[PDB]
UniProtKB/Swiss-Prot annotation, chains A, B:
Quaternary structure (record): Forms oligomers of increasing size with increasing protein concentration. The fragment of 1-83 probably forms oligomers of 4 dimeric units at 10 degrees Celsius, at 40 degrees Celsius only dimers are formed. Binds Hha and YdgT (also known as cnu); crystal structures suggest each H-NS dimer could bind 2 Hha monomers on opposites sides. Probably also binds StpA.
GO aspect biological process, one term: negative regulation of gene expression, epigenetic
Gene Ontology cellular component terms for the protein in this record: cytosol; nucleoid; protein-DNA complex
Name the record gives this protein: DNA-binding protein H-NS
Region of interest called Responsible for protein oligomerization, as start-end residue ranges on this chain: 1-63
Lineage, uppermost ranks: Bacteria, Pseudomonadati, Pseudomonadota, Gammaproteobacteria, Enterobacterales
Location(s) in or outside the cell: Cytoplasm, Nucleoid
Consequence the record notes for mutating R11H: No longer binds Hha or YdgT, slightly altered DNA-binding, may self associate into longer than wild-type filaments. Derepression
Amino acid sequence: SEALKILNNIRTLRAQARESTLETLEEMLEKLEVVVNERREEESAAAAEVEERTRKLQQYREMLIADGIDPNELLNSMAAA
Amino acid sequence: SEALKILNNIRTLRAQARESTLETLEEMLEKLEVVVNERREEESAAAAEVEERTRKLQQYREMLIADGIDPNELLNSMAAA
């Protein structure tokens, strides 16, 4: 990328910044800023969606062994019926 | 059976029955009827304890499904960790 290239670098920015009135920058930040969250969303969203799943395993791992249940055999018991 | 095989037929029972005094008879039913409970328990046992095991394979199918879970993969999941 050619744009992002520069928007990662302060001194380079400050420069290309002098170019435009606050009005722009300020407004156009707001813009960036949302995009960001827009991601911070998907990210934090699929975070729960996942971990949550595997937490179930821990508990099942437990509730199976807690009801004594052996792993292998029993899994099939519910895999064929 | 040589023995019991006959005691299946009232007629015939009624028969080798005339022979003894209810005194005894009375008393030997006592005997038997207990013996049957001797079993009644053992049996009434394993059933419960078996319908018990299988019963959770109800609550689990119902929980897997109820937590939107494909058995297949998820079986192996807890198997490795």
